[PDB]
Write a protein that binds this ligand. Structure first.
Ligand SMILES: OC[C@H]1O[C@@](CO)(O[C@H]2O[C@H](CO)[C@@H](O)[C@H](O)[C@H]2O)[C@@H](O)[C@@H]1O
Length: 618
């Protein structure tokens, strides 16, 4: 290619007043972008032609970036998302406050909680009919009418931004709704857009891929491939049948998606949850996951953002085994130049496992096996979310090692399914071992306690819930609270009586916000008020501990008491966790300390059942 030629295409649509800063960033990241793109599409006859054109469109989008956001681009500090005041909150805009304007009216609630990061679930145009809770996107550039307009989105981000809250939005970049403008163009016979997806005239290729492909909905939707009349072909569909996998091997797809992303950024979104990002690249003979190219694709999108909107962050999802997570942060030449965040799905699943089995040693294993985060990278740590808990990511760990004996994922799954006598949990099986649905409060024993009017059990359960969250709060990066958990909200059986949802078990833990329950957060004596106060405590404390910043180290101290989990941050902070229902103490000699206690140390630390203690070493 011809660098000066490509740079000129990019510049040009730029405003003379901002041309200097942008061209400066373009000069330091462009090469990475170009190398990534070349490895992906360099062999194509129309490469150089597409690049130049595309680059010209990237520059025009760069010019349209509102001044306030450009200023943010220049003032924001790298690794900003990893500061100790960062607290995350995830929820559906509709379940939470009806519309985007309604959500804006609720910002005072988020501010009171201490939220600085707000993830709104899919809110862009979704397929008519069932749209997988918004995950079948029909237009990446338009808010879903029932939720509002693009104007409300902009007004919302401006409101959140002044409250120090960064909007995280889903970029469902692996697949589109089958009614997206592209699928409709494809369905109409437009070969150009038909090529934006994976399509096959026969069952030939599908049969092959299926030989080594796993399944996301083995029961509900063995839909991994679908025959579509309109296109007269088999369409790759990893998820529901109406969600078509995009063909990222086509530069057109890459170019249009990078643009879509930059337009969202321009509307004020600061963080992009790259949904199903492990499935991006398809290659025969492979499970088509975590492929090397998927990573190159991410490096490219990352370069595009470093140049056009550096204040923006990319968060990888990927529900995969531990060894597959860290590479989303970039590898070798590209380490530190891929995703800034990754959901620590292993830590989260390991937490519920540790709780059911009353084994702190399982958490020690996860942390010990958690490699140190690269420069300006961090974890998205969490307790629950809109999805089912995927246990199978803990297979390797379940096998056990020299320090930790084996554990049964099957036993854990049954415990939370309440298919085993004595269980305080009330969840359900989703799709052998696979997944479990249910609210945190429902899994922690709170729902069962309330169900039986047993105050003793309720308190113990509150402890279990707080325990799990204390861990996420002690982690380097963004601890994401799932809507309602701060009030101990329980399951929502309502979907069962709904022909539109009864088929999707995950609705069990996707309730509408209980604002009357929210008002109780004040009555310190109420359950909600109690849970809310305990969490609020840990949040205010973590905000005051520079030792918890993402740049500080994360490690765990090996103990011979299987029930305890000792987590350390930097060299001055240690959090002790008792995952058993038994009172016990941790000897200071077992952690090499002798000091302070957070929101006084001389002798072992006594930890009640399911208790947590934060201490400042020394
Ligand atoms: O069983 C859940 C299955 O789907 C995943 C993909 O990583 O979830 C994300 O993407 C789905 C399809 O777009 C959404 O339905 C889901 O809500 C979203 O979190 C994983 O949770 C898991 O592999």
């Amino acid at each position: 290619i011809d660098p000066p030629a490509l740079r000129a295409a990019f510049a040009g649509p730029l405003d003379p007043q901002h041309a200097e800063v942008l061209l400066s960033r373009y000069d330091q990241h462009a090469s990475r972008l170009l190398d990534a793109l070349h490895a992906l599409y360099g062999q194509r006859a129309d490469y150089a032609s597409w690049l130049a054109q595309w680059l010209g469109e990237v520059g025009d989008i760069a010019r349209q970036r509102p001044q306030a956001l450009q200023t943010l681009d220049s003032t924001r500090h790298a690794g900003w998302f990893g500061q100790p005041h960062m607290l995350g909150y995830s929820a559906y805009a509709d379940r939470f406050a009806g519309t985007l304007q309604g959500v804006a009216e609720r910002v005072p609630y988020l501010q009171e909680l201490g939220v600085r990061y707000l993830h709104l679930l899919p809110f862009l145009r979704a397929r008519a009919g069932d749209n997988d809770g918004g995950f079948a996107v029909s237009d990446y550039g338009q808010v879903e009418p029932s939720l509002g307009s693009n104007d409300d989105l902009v007004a919302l981000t401006s409101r959140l931004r002044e409250a120090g809250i960064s909007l995280c939005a889903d970029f469902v970049l692996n697949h589109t709704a089958d009614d997206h403008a592209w699928a409709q163009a494809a369905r109409a016979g437009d070969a150009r857009y038909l090529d934006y997806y994976h399509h096959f005239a026969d069952r030939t290729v599908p049969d092959r891929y299926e030989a080594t492909l796993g399944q996301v909905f083995p029961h509900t939707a063995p839909g991994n491939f679908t025959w579509v009349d309109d296109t007269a072909q088999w369409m790759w569909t990893t998820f529901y049948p109406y969600q078509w996998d995009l063909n990222w091997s086509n530069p057109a797809v890459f170019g249009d998606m990078a643009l879509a992303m930059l337009r969202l950024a321009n509307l004020g979104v600061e963080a992009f949850r790259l949904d199903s990002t492990a499935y991006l690249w398809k290659r025969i003979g492979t499970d088509c996951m975590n492929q090397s190219e998927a990573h190159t694709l991410l490096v490219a999108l990352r370069a595009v953002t470093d140049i056009v909107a550096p204040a923006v962050v990319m968060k990888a999802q990927a529900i995969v085994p531990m060894t597959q997570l860290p590479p989303y942060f970039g590898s070798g030449v590209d380490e530190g130049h891929e995703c800034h965040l990754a959901y620590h799905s292993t830590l989260m699943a390991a937490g519920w496992s540790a709780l059911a089995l009353q084994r702190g040693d399982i958490l020690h294993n996860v942390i010990a096996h958690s490699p140190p985060l690269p420069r300006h990278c961090a974890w998205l740590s969490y307790v629950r979310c809109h999805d089912d808990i995927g246990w199978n990511v803990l297979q390797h760990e379940a096998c056990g090692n020299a320090a930790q004996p084996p554990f049964s994922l099957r036993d854990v799954a049954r415990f939370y399914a309440n298919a085993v006598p004595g269980s305080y949990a009330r969840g359900e099986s989703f799709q052998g071992v696979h997944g479990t649905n249910g609210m945190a409060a429902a899994l922690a024993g709170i729902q069962a306690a309330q169900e039986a009017g047993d105050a003793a059990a309720l308190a113990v359960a509150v402890d279990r819930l707080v325990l799990l969250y204390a861990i996420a709060l002690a982690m380097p990066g963004v601890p994401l609270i799932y809507m309602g958990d701060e009030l101990a909200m329980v399951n929502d059986p309502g979907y069962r009586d709904d022909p539109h949802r009864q088929h999707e078990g995950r609705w069990l833990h996707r309730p509408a916000m209980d604002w009357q329950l929210a008002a109780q957060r004040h009555d310190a004596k109420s359950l909600s008020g109690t849970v809310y106060r305990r969490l609020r405590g840990l949040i205010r404390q973590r905000a005051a501990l520079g030792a918890l910043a993402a740049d500080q180290a994360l490690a765990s101290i090996a103990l011979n008491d299987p029930r305890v989990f000792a987590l350390t941050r930097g060299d001055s902070f240690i959090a002790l966790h008792n995952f058993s229902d038994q009172l016990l103490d941790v000897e200071l000699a077992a952690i090499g300390v002798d000091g302070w206690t957070l929101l006084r140390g001389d002798g072992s630390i006594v930890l009640p059942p399911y208790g947590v203690r934060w201490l400042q070493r020394g």
